[PDB]
Design a protein around this ligand. Sequence first.
Ligand SMILES: O=C(O)CCCCCCCCCCCCCCC(=O)O
Lengths: 245, 259
Amino acid sequence: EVKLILYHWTHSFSSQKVRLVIAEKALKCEEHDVSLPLSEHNEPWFMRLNSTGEVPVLIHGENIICEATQIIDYLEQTFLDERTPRLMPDKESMYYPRVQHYRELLDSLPMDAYTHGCILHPELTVDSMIPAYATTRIRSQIGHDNVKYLKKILDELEKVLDQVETELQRRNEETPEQQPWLCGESFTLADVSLAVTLHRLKFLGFARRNWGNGKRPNLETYYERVLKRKTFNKVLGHVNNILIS
Amino acid sequence: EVKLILYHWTHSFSSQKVRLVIAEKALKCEEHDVSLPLSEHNEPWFMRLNSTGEVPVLIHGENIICEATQIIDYLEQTFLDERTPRLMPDKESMYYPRVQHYRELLDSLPMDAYTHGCILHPELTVDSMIPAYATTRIRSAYIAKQKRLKSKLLDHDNVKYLKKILDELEKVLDQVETELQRRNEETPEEGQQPWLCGESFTLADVSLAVTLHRLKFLGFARRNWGNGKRPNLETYYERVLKRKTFNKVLGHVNNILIS
Ligand SMILES: O=C(O)CCCCCCCCCCCCCCC(=O)O
């Protein structure tokens, strides 16, 4: 009788975290993807990745909530039925600080700057999933964006992923052969931030410099496991496929 | 073919500005009032004024826009058909500075704090349209001294705050009264009168009209106009009540008999 309504863009980074939370909490939601296959300039989704500074919006009865973080906090606070999974420990738990620390650390990453850098300076990527012609078109209609800045924030990204790799190492040492996620046994909001972040870095071609082939092996094992998680696959299994509008 | 969709609360101050803009631009819009006649605690709308910190949202094609100011800017920038009224002068107009100045001056008013203050400190109102029982519901030996004291201090601070912003509100309305005086002096007394900034109804008039109507609802009208005080403002308020768009959109929003 009281619908959950979400208006969103399928390929928006924000929308992906919201929809993965909806799936992990097993909620029924009427989801409206308002994006078009082709823009006014007949550009496809992969050339419009931060076209605007606009947010998804949730309508739930009387409540209208904008922005992924606020929507996700609303969802965690509202759906308290016993059979609805929680994605945060209680605020008085000693585990709350760890989950909130990693959620905030990952949500602070400038994903918009990585995407413009992938397109502007593809020489800094390996196996970018964005066609090369996107690069030559954005650089033409030009003729903040500097190589200096982008190399700086890619190194800052390395320091965040070092902290994550260390945390995942502590999980491995604690755990025999039911494997834990980033912060503990439960899949949490820090895991949706991490999983959706890694999948987008993969899309941008910033996966191989940060993990794989012996580098950050715990992170690589985490990424491979996330891809198989049924909720992640059901919600995000195609969001990296440029053949699908 | 491309619908305008608005989700909003009818009695929300923000929603009122957005819906008045939609009416003044003559746009077709699918409007969803998500407010309930009765809350879980069987309270009606006039006991839930700023219940939460939430905004209206406009969906238009691929665009999702939240908050009244951003929605209104989007509407002004997007609907450019020749027959669609403009509520802002062109950015190169000699009028643009004056409309933008009054729009931002009125949009800077802390309407939420006037609402909180009307309910918590009704002794500072005259002819509040909110029943007195809404006040008594919100207000509902050893360390009983401490909390008697702690509560007395926040009460002291909260009255001080409210008196401070009511004096700031007077200075805004003084500027508006002076502006409307210039309009009167410029215009022959017989015939059609301009609005706040000139002949056309603008975004500054939207902000002013909806602000005055809410001040009336809260009982902050009699200290600010009427009985010889700010007579240009009083004439403006009585005129905007008769404007067809304002009456069609907002004619009952102050009536607590209507759910
Ligand atoms: O003029 C009305 O009361 C609204 C009628 C609805 C149709 C739209 C007319 C737009 C009017 C633009 C500004 C004109 C000011 C009229 C002021 C007055 O006559 O008191």
